[PDB]
Amino acid sequence: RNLSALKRHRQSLKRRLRNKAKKSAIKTLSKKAIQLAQEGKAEEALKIMRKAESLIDKAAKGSTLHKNAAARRKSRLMRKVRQLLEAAGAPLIGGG
């Protein structure tokens, strides 16, 4: 009727709340920049995409994201903005 396993569980929730919070923003700020790119609206898309890049890697600093998950998440974020902006171009500002 006890353990140090109960402490590992109390901690797992402090981290779960923290990991879910970071992923929510990553998906929000990223998708936000992909809609903006489709409109394009390039300075606005790229000004947001960069904060989506920053949040991604800042998550890989710890346990929220593996290095490769972030690098793959970054790869698809940028790749979608390129083609989307190829229609109705003008990439200004710059981020690639």
Partner RNA sequence: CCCUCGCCAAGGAACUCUGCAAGUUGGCCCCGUAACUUCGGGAGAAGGGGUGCUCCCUGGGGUGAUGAGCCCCGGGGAGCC
Partner RNA sequence: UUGGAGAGUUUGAUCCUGGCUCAGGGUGAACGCUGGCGGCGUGCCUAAGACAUGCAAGUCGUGCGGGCCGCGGGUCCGUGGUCAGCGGCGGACGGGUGAGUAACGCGUGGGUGACCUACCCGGAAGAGGGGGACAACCCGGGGAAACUCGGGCUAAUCCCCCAUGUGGACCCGCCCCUUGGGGUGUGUCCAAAGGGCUUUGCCCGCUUCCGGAUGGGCCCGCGUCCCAUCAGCUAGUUGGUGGGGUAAUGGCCCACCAAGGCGACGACGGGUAGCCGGUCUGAGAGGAUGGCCGGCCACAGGGGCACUGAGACACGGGCCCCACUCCUACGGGAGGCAGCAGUUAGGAAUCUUCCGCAAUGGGCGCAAGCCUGACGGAGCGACGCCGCUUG
Partner RNA sequence: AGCGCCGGCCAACUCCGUGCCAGCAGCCGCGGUAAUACGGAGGGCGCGAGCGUUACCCGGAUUCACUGGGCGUAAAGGGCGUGUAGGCGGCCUGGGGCGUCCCAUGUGAAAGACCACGGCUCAACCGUGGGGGAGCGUGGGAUACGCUCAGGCUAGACGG
Partner RNA sequence: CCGAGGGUAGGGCCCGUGACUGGGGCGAAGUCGUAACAAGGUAGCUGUACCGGAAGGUGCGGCUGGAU
Footprint on this chain of RNA (rule: CB under 7 A): 3-16, 18-20, 50, 53-54, 56-58, 60-64, 66-72, 74-79, 82, 94-96
11 binds Mg ion (CB under 5 A): no
Could you tell which of Mg ion, RNA, none binds residue 28, using a CB distance below 5 to 8 A set by kind?
Mg ion
Going from the C-alpha of 79 to that of each of 9, 30, 54, 75, 84, the distances in angstroms are 39, 12, 16, 6, 9
12 binds Mg ion (CB under 5 A): no
Nearer to RNA, 19 or 41 (CB): 19
The Cα–Cα gap between 34 and 18 comes to 25
Residue 69 Ramachandran class (φ > 0 left, ψ -120 to 50 alpha, else beta): alpha
Smallest separation, CB 19 to RNA (Å): 3
Cβ atoms of 56 and 73 within 8 Å: the answer is yes
60 binds Mg ion (CB under 5 A): yes
**Residue 61 DSSP symbol:** T
Residues contributing to the site for Mg ion (CB under 5 A): 28, 60
